[PDB]
Structure 1
C-alpha cells in the first residue's frame, strides 16, 4: 500500500465519512508526505456512537473544509505511543496540544477511548477512537 492514512480516500469503506478526507482535505502531503504520523481515525461504528448530530456534521461537506484548518490537532507527529514507551503520558498534536494517553485501566485519550487499540500504520500510526477529540470539530 502507498499513502497509508491518506490513501483511504481511494477506498474508504470504514473511514468513508472521515479518513477519505485525509487525502481529499489536502492532508495527503502532510500525513504521507513525510513519514511517521499518528491520527485518531474513528471507525464507522464510532460515528454511530455519537449519531445525534455529530455524524451529520461530519457527513456534511462543510467539515472536511474545516478539517483542512483543524488537521493539526487531529494529526500527531511521528512519535511512538505508550505501546512502545509506557502507558500514562501526554502526546502532543502538531497544532501544539498535549493530550492524555493512558492504556492501563482502559486505553483512553483526553477522555475518549481507543476501543480498538491499533497502532501500526504503513507510514505512521493508527488508532481507532469511538468518539471525537478536537478543538470544536
Structure 2
C-alpha cells in the first residue's frame, strides 16, 4: 500500500514514496492494516519558508523513520466505523483526538482527503503535517 507508493509515487512522491524506498517496505506493508496520515502533495508545497525544501530532501524521511512508531499504528479503524468522537493511539505512545461530527479533524489537523481504506490497511490525508519531525 504505502510501500506500493514508493514503487510509483504519483501523489506521495515527497513522503510516502520514501516509505518503501526508506527500507520501510517490509515495515509498513509488513503484514496488517497500517494507518498512516500521509498529507496531500499540495500540503507539502503549501508549507511556507524552506520547509518544502527541507521536506524535499530524502533526509526528512529519515527523521520520520526514527519516530515512525508515532506515525505507525496497528489495527486502527476509522471512528465513523464505530462511534463519532474517539482517539488515535500511536505505537510510539501518543493518543490523538479523532473527531468527525461538527467538523472532521485529528489532533487539530483536518484530514483534507480522508481515504480511510488503504491498499493494505488504512490511509488518511492531512492538509498539513502530523507526527514529530
Superposition TM-score, scaled by structure 2 size: 0.92
Cα pair distance change 1:53/1:87, threshold 3 Å: farther
Greater shift in the superposed pair: 107-116 or 70-79: 70-79
Inter-partner Cα distance in structure 2 for 1:52 and 1:18: 18
| CA RMSD of superposed structures (Å) | 1.3
User: Residue 34 of structure 1: CA displacement?
Assistant: 1.3
SS at match of 2:6: helix
Query: Does the 8 A contact of 1:119 with 1:125 survive in 2?
Result: yes
The structure richer in helix per residue is: 2
CA contact (8 A) 1:36 1:79 kept: yes
CA contact (8 A) 1:27 1:71 kept: no
User: What is the aligned residue count?
Assistant: 133
Offset at residue 118 of structure 1 (A): 1.5
Task: Give the equivalent residue in structure 1 for 2:51.
Answer: 54
Contact 1:118 1:128 in 2 (8 A): yes
Kindly indicate whether residue 65 of structure 2 is the aligned counterpart of residue 68 of structure 1: yes
Alignment deviations for residues 53-89 of structure 1 (CA, whole Å, 9 cap, x no partner): 3222211121122222121111222221212011211
Q: Is the 8 A contact 1:37 1:79 kept in 2?
A: yes
Contact between 2:109 and 2:127, CA under 8 Å: does it hold in 1? yes
Would you say the 8 A contact 1:87–1:102 is kept in 2?
yes
Tell me by how many angstroms 1:109 deviates: 0.7
8 Å contact kept, 2:113–2:124? yes
Instruction: Using structure 1 for the length normalisation, give the TM-score.
Output: 0.90
